[PDB]
Amino acid sequence: QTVFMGDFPMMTEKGTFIINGTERVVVSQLVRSPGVYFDETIDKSTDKT
Amino acid sequence: LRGSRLGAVSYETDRNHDLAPRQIARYRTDNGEEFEVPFADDAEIPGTWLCRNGMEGTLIEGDLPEPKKVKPPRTHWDMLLERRSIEELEELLKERLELIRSRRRG
């Protein structure tokens, strides 16, 4: 078939979306990437890494 | 963002110098609780009253009109009765009676 999935908001030429007449901007988010992160601490009760 | 309690405040001034005369009635529950209600003078006194406790109380005055409360709406026995017959149930009772007989004494 060809199913109507819904209206999708479209960014204008200026980099902004228009929701309910108002103008809104989706701010890029800095997150912590998934992966492996090997980290170390010290133990003052033992002085070992 | 206005709001209201669905009520109205009256800007009236207290008139304690004269009020309409008010009579006082004494109601009593079944468990010996007493309650005083300042009812209106030119008004009827309902002998059966819902009191401050929450249960139904009657007036200390002796009237007892007995409103003829309703029978229980429907019992399990009523529901079995309408879908079966008395002799069928008697046959089943006999069946269980002789069943426990044959279980016990053999």
Partner: protein, 49 residues
């Protein structure tokens, strides 16, 4: 969310009478999009001084 709904209704609905029109529910997808663009800390009001 829509996939949970669709795989719920795959089983309960009779076979040899269905089509993706009858199976797909687009209300949760459009609800999710509308909930993202409105009332989210990242879909910020555009600041034009």
């Amino acid at each position: 969310r829509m996939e949970r709904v669709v795989r719920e209704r795959m089983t309960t609905q009779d076979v040899e009478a269905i089509t993706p029109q009858t199976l797909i529910n687009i209300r949760p997808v459009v609800a999710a999009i509308k909930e993202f663009f409105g009332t989210s800390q990242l879909s910020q009001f555009m600041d034009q001084n």
